[PDB]
Amino acid sequence: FLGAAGSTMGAASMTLTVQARNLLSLTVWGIKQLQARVLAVERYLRDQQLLGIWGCSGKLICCTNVPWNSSWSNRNLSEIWDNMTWLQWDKEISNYTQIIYGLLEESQNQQE
Amino acid sequence: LGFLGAAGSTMGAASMTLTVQALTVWGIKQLQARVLAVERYLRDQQLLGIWGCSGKLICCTNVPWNSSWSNRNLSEIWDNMTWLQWDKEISNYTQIIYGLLEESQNQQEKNEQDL
Amino acid sequence: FLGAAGSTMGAASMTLTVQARNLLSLTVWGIKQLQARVLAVERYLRDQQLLGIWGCSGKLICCTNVPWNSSWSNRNLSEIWDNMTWLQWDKEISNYTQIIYGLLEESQNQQEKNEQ
Amino acid sequence: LWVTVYYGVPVWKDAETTLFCASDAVWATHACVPTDPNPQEIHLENVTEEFNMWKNNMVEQMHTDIISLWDQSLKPCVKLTPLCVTLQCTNVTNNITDDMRGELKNCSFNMTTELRDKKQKVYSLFYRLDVVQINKEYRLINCNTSACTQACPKVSFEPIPIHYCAPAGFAILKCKDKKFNGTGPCPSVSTVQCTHGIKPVVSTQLLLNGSLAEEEVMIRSENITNNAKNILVQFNTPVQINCTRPNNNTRKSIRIGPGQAFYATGDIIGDIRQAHCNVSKATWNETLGKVVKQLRKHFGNNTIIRFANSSGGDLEVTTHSFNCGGEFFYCNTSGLFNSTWISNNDSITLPCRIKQIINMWQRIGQCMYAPPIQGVIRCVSNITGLILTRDGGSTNSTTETFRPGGGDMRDNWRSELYKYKVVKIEPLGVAPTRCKR
Amino acid sequence: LWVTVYYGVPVWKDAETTLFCASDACVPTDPNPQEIHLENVTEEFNMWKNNMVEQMHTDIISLWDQSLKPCVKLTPLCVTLQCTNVTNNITDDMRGELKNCSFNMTTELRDKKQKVYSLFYRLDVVQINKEYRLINCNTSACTQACPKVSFEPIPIHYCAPAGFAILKCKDKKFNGTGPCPSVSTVQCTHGIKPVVSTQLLLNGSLAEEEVMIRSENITNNAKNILVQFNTPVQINCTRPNNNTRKSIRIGPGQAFYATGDIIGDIRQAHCNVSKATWNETLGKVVKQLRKHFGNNTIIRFANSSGGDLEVTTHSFNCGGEFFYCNTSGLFNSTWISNNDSITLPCRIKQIINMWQRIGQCMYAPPIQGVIRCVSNITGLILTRDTTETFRPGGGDMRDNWRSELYKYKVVKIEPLGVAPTRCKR
Amino acid sequence: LWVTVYYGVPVWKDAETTLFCASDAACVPTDPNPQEIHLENVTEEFNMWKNNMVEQMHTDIISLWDQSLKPCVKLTPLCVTLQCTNVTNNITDDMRGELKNCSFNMTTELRDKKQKVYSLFYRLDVVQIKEYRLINCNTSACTQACPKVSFEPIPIHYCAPAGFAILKCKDKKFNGTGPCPSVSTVQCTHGIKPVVSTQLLLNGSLAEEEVMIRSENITNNAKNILVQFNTPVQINCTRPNNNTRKSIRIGPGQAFYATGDIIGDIRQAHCNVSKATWNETLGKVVKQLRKHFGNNTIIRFANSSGGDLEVTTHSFNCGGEFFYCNTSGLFNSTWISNDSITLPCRIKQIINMWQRIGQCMYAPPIQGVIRCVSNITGLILTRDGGSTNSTTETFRPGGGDMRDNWRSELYKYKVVKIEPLGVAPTRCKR
Amino acid sequence: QAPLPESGPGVVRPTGTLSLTCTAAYGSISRHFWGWVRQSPQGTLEWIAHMHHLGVKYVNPSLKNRVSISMDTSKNQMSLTLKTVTATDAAKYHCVRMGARMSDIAFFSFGDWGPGSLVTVSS
Amino acid sequence: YVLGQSSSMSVAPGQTAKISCWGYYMGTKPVNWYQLKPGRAPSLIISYDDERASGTPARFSGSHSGSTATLTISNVVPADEADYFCQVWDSYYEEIYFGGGTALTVLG
Ligand SMILES: *[C@@H]1O[C@H](CO)[C@@H](O[C@@H]2O[C@H](CO)[C@@H](O[C@@H]3O[C@H](CO)[C@@H](O)[C@H](O[C@H]4O[C@H](CO)[C@@H](O)[C@H](O)[C@@H]4O[C@H]4O[C@H](CO)[C@@H](O)[C@H](O)[C@@H]4O)[C@@H]3O)[C@H](O)[C@H]2NC(C)=O)[C@H](O)[C@H]1NC(C)=O
Ligand SMILES: *[C@@H]1O[C@H](CO)[C@@H](O[C@@H]2O[C@H](CO)[C@@H](O)[C@H](O)[C@H]2NC(C)=O)[C@H](O)[C@H]1NC(C)=O
Ligand SMILES: *[C@@H]1O[C@H](CO)[C@@H](O)[C@H](O)[C@H]1NC(C)=O
Ligand SMILES: *[C@@H]1O[C@H](CO)[C@@H](O)[C@H](O)[C@H]1NC(C)=O
Ligand SMILES: *[C@@H]1O[C@H](CO)[C@@H](O)[C@H](O)[C@H]1NC(C)=O
Ligand SMILES: *[C@@H]1O[C@H](CO)[C@@H](O)[C@H](O)[C@H]1NC(C)=O
Ligand SMILES: *[C@@H]1O[C@H](CO)[C@@H](O)[C@H](O)[C@H]1NC(C)=O
Ligand SMILES: *[C@@H]1O[C@H](CO)[C@@H](O)[C@H](O)[C@H]1NC(C)=O
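YS: structure for the whole thing
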């Protein structure tokens, strides 16, 4: 679990299943425990909803028809797959992904 | 949600605009609420998958319409009937149709896919 | 429900739909029977995720690129479709199931994903 | 023709669910999801839905929720079991004003202290409505049915607004028809996620601090010709009412056990004057005239409408009972309902008595003791409705008279949850279309 | 040949879960527990490791506890009682069984006390050294059973949650354990009455073919034997002691229902069984026991050995009053190789320590008038010690509910299955 | 280049979630071993002063303490008028007046009878109104502990739910705030012991190779300094006061355990440390304290300022009794750029922990001489914060909120939330 | 729900703005899709635009830059605004009620045509 | 864009008139057939390639094959003389395509 946190993204793309598997699992204690379980289930479902919106519900890697706008990143396909980790990507792409999810919704709902 | 705006629109007009982008006591309350919501959402999704329409909002099936369900017309039920009216006139017939959808075209087609 | 338990493995492969619907539906009692509902939901979701990893997605009767290793019961298809129920198949495959799960998980899905 | 499956079809049925809290932030408003920035209301164009204010489940769930909240708040509070003692009481004839004679009593009694072997002789002022002789020997009116739980002084009874929101997969249908009686079809409907703020005001004869009707006074009833069914009158212009307790009372603290304090009433600083409510006479008669005009529609424009006071019963049904800043008033509404309309400044002063031992919600065996509120109490509110009853049939007469009625406390919330109903959505639908595969 | 995945395969294994009750802390039932008969099935049941019983035990315990939460706690009843005998038509039997006790009791007013009196059974009072005290004051004061709630056992139906199933065996000759050729899948269990009793199982179900003997290891004398009857044996229990119930207000809103004066003669409560029917049923039981101990052994029925009154006597509840009957006339016989009635004298107790728990008792208020009930003996609990002696048994209450949940078990369903097929992706 | 979606991506973000017990066998048993995975080449920002675990652990420990006191006796009848005299037994001069012999009247099993009884009460529990009363009768009625339930700190582990991870900082020189080069992910924490103490961390976890010094703001005199020891300094605490508990039946099934007769002489309960070990440990502390405070400073250790006894004294629980020891002999020294220290201790029975008012517990007397040995593995200090005119700064033992005790244990742990949705450009398309 | 005769100015000057209003009769205008079709003097029919009251609108791309379509459900009407009128715009504008089915194949059908308003482009 | 249509043509009474509609952007989209007479507004006579509108006699019929749609009028009476048009909806281009219109006249 999480072992590829420091590995490159290409070398961390073959360990997706382990991360995906751990996303699913007096009285006052039971309230908190059951609430945490239901919350985890809701996150899994509400993010699978996103996956199925883009038309790849059953897949772990989805390739779409959205063109990669240069306005984000603007770097080589070798540096960003053999010389970085995903955590380094999160900080750079953050505060753009909320529009990418759009242009990922549309380019699937409307194009197909 | 709030998509109910087309409630008075005819089915033909609905269907279309329907392709546009789509402590310890109350703790029991807003836990049964969310558990029931999740169960219902999962039941509808599973039912669709059972019919073979897993991702499709509109899905044509191979179950012919019986000549004892509506028998009205096809140009007026889409131009002079609302979805609420349709459910009122079709209710208590939906269970048979669900059974036909579940048995046919998925149970009788998935097996024939590799046979 | 469960009417094909004593029937042939293939005749029972005509009713997978009826055994799938039943899989999901004082403060002390409510808590006791809330974790039953949450448990049922999470178990169904785990089975569905396992299928989705295996490329079964939403299907019921899939087909896999994993080949049937000859060291698994050594029987013919006629015996494993005509004079045997799902229960003795389950009791015969026992143990030889985590190997099947791994082979489905990685030998087909990940290999095909990196192949594409 | 073939079956086609549509997900997202606009279909609902009538259904009962468990709507939850919504506030806009020491009561139970913290364990209640807070409201959204701006309500999301959609107008269902050309849809006519059937409402029935009298078979609504929201009223019953609000009833149960309010009882549960009230019971939850009176749990960590002091249980006045020791108060069930023999009280030696005298009269309070000091600055009595010829009208509050006999209503107050000065009772001395022995109560427990923080030490178990010692007792203290203390005194308190109790209202006549809360004592009974045991044959100058007195006992609290509750010490033969249940022991009273003292309300914690920290909590406030001021009704905070609460919104009711339907869970996921459910909706609430608001009826925006200005002339909606409350039963039958409403040809102007909207869908809302949450109701507007509903103050859990508790009152018996006069609905207070409620929602006003638009452009006319509205008369509502389950069966107008049935005299056993109450008549709900919703005003369009509020009638302002000012209630005060002139007495300037002082609050004591008696230590009755380890960590337990009982708040008695000390000597009144000043004179003893009755609590009273004032309603402007001109406004009251101009509003009762509108009520008469609207009532004539359901009985004919020749009948004479008479207004008389309460028939009989307990003090919580023959008086306008309310809670004005922590003190529980029971007011004599005889000067309001006393009139006769045939076919065509100044103030009214309603006397009020004050009670400390409250058996709220007609429950037996569960009482609550209200600690005194120090200083003069004055509160201004709006009368926004009435609850009336028609007596018998008086068959073959031109006279219809109406008397104020209390009934249940659900009727206080039928007047707010009358334009709403709860529905369950079916996304799924099956229709005939030309398709295949 | 390639692996093929199936979801919805009808398979199961033994499971442990929490079931829910479906009454007619409980939910309403279904119109009918539709039993789908599973043909060509042969599944192994074990009535003695069934957790459906360990769950019902805790369920009934909790239901009993929550039924006593709002009721009056008789803390003030733990006082010094001044007691005397009850004379005046006492009968030779039942002499000293009742005591007339006066005591000071708290009123609704904290500064006033009332001198009240009541009739207590000898089994509930112990001398202090005339002066007595209630037997529970050393261990714990206890609640008083509210007259509104009844002790009548309402049926409960245990239902399988989602993803589980309940299998019921329809074999006529089940031993309680082993294979069962005829199995069905039932959604909710039949109506099981939680009858609390010892020695004699009451109002149970009948074997439908012959007397059945069920043991865990019948060659182990420590284990108990459950005997099921093909035909019921009627038992008529009565308390001919017409008595008044007086209400004493012991505080604000709290009333203690005491015993007043018994109108008439003092007579001992008893249960009558028919001698002929009992002999016939004992003959059937002896015949079935000979199948397991050989056809030449001497079968001797003797009475219980020793212990508390709750284990040496047939204890039950007859119309709100707690009976303890001396069943030494039923189990007194010897079979070597091949009207009239039996009267069992019972004693009534008012302080009840149910389910062998210590520190929580319950006061059963007196029931006005003559109490009479009729019931069916449909089983026995026996203990064994060339002659085999069997005595009535009084083990844990689970054995009472084992005899009803003996043809049911809970299984967990597996949807996933992998089979070889001639197909490739 | 087209957007490609990845699920199962290993990226995380700081979160504030709820963790559950792992009480080894309202808490569940652990696995055979809490396996950890070392994350290579990862640098994570840690800050133990904003950690949510130190707050949830506080609430959990308070709640478990409350739960063990639900089924126990409530000493309401104990609030009576006590007639107390001095013990005047074979006392020493330091135990003059500390214990009192009180006679009083208690309810029996039978409600109409009362029994005259006696008990020995420490001075800190009685307040005079020869007539005294228990100090709590003004505020609440104390709940006596069930004699079976123990006050031993049993190890608990906090395990994160699905979709969350626990990151452990393995960096040795980690000062509590900043980057941590060596990071592992654990299923959940190691056995953490909820040891309740003030001014002195007991039987905790030691540092490696150096004595560590931690603070939210080393220059802010209002923030307590946490000192973590390299080697333990062992305390021996005893109560040489051979005791006898007698049960008094105060109701129908309720027993109150009262101090009987102390057979033998009566002496101060006391703790002992080694002089040499304490001096070496303070030498290490001063050496590591200079690194933050300039090489030319003069370091003074003095005793606590004043206030409640629960803060001015080293308070702990030794074999079921509650000790409050006078830690003036330890923190008394000036440092310029086989003996034993005996700390006198008082004993209380009426205790209100966690600064809560209105809920008090009464610790029953424990029979016989009580001895305990334990390790000091840290201090909670506080600088005086005077003026820069002087080059000498004084440090006094602290003892504030109990979270400081659990910070010293959960300082290498942070909770993170797994975000498994990742978008990256790839050729593929469609 | 058939349309009443349209309302139109009769003549519009070149470069002017053409305003047309169609009032639905015998029912609600929020029931269906409604559209505008101009018939040339020769006899050809050119579809202009159409819409459903909830906001979905389809406008002929050849006239997208100058067509504005709207509804008012209170008055039960629709309005068309044609900016920068040219000589070729002179035609008889019909207000048509339509149907619409939608399965896998999208569908529209111009059900009930109005009498039409004649628009002549002249100064 | 305008769909192609048959040239304006004439029939003798009792014969059958076939009107054809074709075009590259037609494809399989269903065709609606409309009638236009002097003094009236245009009316639907055929919908979804074969559905007879209300008032459409059994004489009128429709068919769709390939990129060609055929409106067939049998037993022609002089009342049928009118201008006839075909219409489709293109979702990909989101446009209505009307036919160019065929003038059906009657001899005799
Ligand atoms: C109909 O609606 C109207 C308006 O919405 C209601 O009239 C309001 O009534 C409330 C309650 O009486 C009143 O609120 C009080 O107003 C006082 C004067 O402004 C305040 O002094 C008082 O504050 C005290 O009570 C609070 C609640 O407990 C405390 O939080 C607060 O700290 C104050 O308590 C301290 O101070 C008092 C001072 O005497 C002292 O005695 C206490 O011990 C404590 O030390 C409340 O805010 C509103 O002002 C009224 N609004 C108007 C416009 O007049 C009317 O009651 C409603 N009718 C019905 C039937 O519900
Ligand atoms: C209960 O009584 C004690 C004893 O008097 C009170 O504690 C005293 O409080 C006063 C008030 O400031 C102080 O001056 C004394 O120094 C306190 N004495 C001790 C020994 O603490 C306590 O405050 C009282 N509690 C109440 C009134 O709630
Ligand atoms: C369709 O179902 C009805 C029953 O409602 C039946 O009468 C009819 O024959 C069925 N038709 C076909 C084709 O199955
Ligand atoms: C007190 O009041 C009661 C009732 O008003 C009256 O009967 C009694 O005489 C009064 N006593 C005195 C002393 O005023
Ligand atoms: C009658 O009472 C006396 C004294 O209380 C007692 O000794 C005697 O045993 C009682 N009689 C019986 C039969 O127990
Ligand atoms: C209480 O006393 C009785 C006898 O009077 C005894 O049997 C019982 O065990 C005692 N209970 C105790 C000591 O808890
Ligand atoms: C019960 O009968 C079964 C046969 O079905 C047998 O295996 C078992 O040993 C028997 N047990 C007892 C106690 O008789
Ligand atoms: C023992 O006797 C019984 C009598 O019913 C008989 O059925 C059984 O076969 C006998 N067993 C033997 C002789 O082994």
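YS: worth flagging: Helices of chain B lie at 11-17, 26-51, 83-90, 94-114.
IM: good catch. Also Chain B is about 55% helix and 5% strand.
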